[PDB]
Design a protein around this nucleic acid. Sequence first.
RNA 1: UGGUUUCUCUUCAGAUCGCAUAAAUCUUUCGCCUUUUACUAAAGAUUUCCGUGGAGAGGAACAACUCUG
Lengths: 146, 49, 49, 373
Amino acid sequence: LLTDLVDDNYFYLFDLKAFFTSKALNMAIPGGPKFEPLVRDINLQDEDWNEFNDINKIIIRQPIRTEYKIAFPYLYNNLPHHVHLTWYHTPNVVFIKTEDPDLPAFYFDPLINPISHRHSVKSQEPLPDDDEEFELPEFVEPFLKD
Amino acid sequence: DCLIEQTHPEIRKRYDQDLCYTDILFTEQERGVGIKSTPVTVVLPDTKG
Amino acid sequence: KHAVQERLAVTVCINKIDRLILELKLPPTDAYYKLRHIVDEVNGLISMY
Amino acid sequence: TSVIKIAVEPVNPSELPKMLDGLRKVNKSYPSLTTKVEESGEHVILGTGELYLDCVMHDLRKMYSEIDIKVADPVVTFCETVVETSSLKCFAETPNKKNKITMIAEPLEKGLAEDIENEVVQITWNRKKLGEFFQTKYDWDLLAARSIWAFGPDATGPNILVDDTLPSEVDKALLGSVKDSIVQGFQWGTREGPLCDELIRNVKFKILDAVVAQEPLHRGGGQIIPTARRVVYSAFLMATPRLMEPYYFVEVQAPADCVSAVYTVLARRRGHVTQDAPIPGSPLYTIKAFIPAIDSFGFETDLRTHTQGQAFSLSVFHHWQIVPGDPLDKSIVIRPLEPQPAPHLAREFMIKTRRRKGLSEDVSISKFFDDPM
RNA sequence: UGGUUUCUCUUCAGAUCGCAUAAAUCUUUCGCCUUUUACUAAAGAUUUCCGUGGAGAGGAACAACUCUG
């Protein structure tokens, strides 16, 4: 009884800071809130065909949905009022969990895209830096107790 | 911020939330991407130092 | 491409190294092969200017 | 290049210098924010991405200026490129009725436009160094390369005219080549586009023949520079032009369970998948692709929505490509709302570019600058 | 230097004091409205209650087990 995978599932359309843009801009997220009413009274229909917002002078390549205005509200919503910003680009915190506790502690999981070559250098023969570092003695314990 | 905590004795590190001191703008703390570079001058010692 | 065109220096630094152990659980023998893949790709991308 | 352009106007029209003072202060904060006042009076603002324009609108409405400034939906900056070569020579007319410079229009190669845009060739370099790159990369004639004209606007736009179709000692009355009159004409005429008031790109103007006056102080000395700009605008209209929409480079990271959702999202916005391959180390595969910037609005927001929040994309600038159709083509009735993916998009893009001055409605008036003779 | 607990009483709480969250009141808004209370939820600030945090005071249990230094 838990549904914790990452901090990015409920990030774009279910985060608690994202619903403040759903209430202040009076535009509901498709599934998130329960259609809370507007804060102010003036909703729309301020001008039919203004010289700035004319329908003919707009290249509508793709429609601006309600999910677009909730993400970046200042670039899309004309005259906002008390819009709380959302948190952007939660990092890839994905973790390869262990399937069974028979594998050891640190193990190369099969659901990992491996390194293909890993043989870019040409060191089949011993390098001349090894003979140069042959006069570098060492007799102490390593950096941690193994 | 890790270089500031190593230089300054201002222990306000990542106990619960992050300690991003370079992002000074309020929009940089809310959005979390940062929209302004900030120059930082501190005294970072070398190995001799 | 922007730093090499401005005739400046370059010094890579593999930060967030805790994710290779505490977030991937990779073996240490394969971690050196992955860290060499970054330094080969960074020096390979540096061979443009 | 800041391809995205979003207009901004205040709600109350009495607060016009308050939004004008805020746009000046916002231009000093962000370096790439070049607030260019349009000829129609609409204060435009050039931006890079969606997060860049939202961060610029955040300080201008809340911190730099305390006035409710309405911002419309953005639009990408187009281009004015000649796809085909010239069909017929031009015939300009000086107001002193003495000079008549003819120039044909031909496009450049793919490697020549990319090298000039990357500032590889230098106008301050020697004539032999310009001839060596033209003989290697372009492989043209040595006579034409030794007498090439100037470049486009501010010596950086790929609009290198060809002032060597005429011989060297043909007239030599005023300049003999593109030095004084045709130099300022190609530098100013390439800025304001004759198609949709955009920037000219990849247009080599081959000056075939020209007529000069023997007494430049008696005849029109500075009058040939607007006369050549009418000849330069007539050359782009008489070479079958095509508007070039910009592209955006998108590199989205996603796991293998959400991979076809990235391909389905780019297909709705007409994006071509360039290279999809699993990145080493992390199990999230990388998918680098191309996307046209005219329909890339909210593509990062749509890639995170459909892929159950497990994806993340970033838009980088990419070189331009010609949009289909032609703005000078007729018999294309564009719909006012919900347009088609039909190849008549260039006629719709030229009519949508008529919000500013210049290329207004009924854009078939290029014969006023290209009158027959 | 020297005490793990527990119960009583004295302040400030500007820390998600509360990783969760009720009611009433006041000033403005909507819907019904037919007299009124019980009503619907948008904004703000005033109490009550469910609770809590450091720091001195008084009793009980091995305070002696010797805790950190």
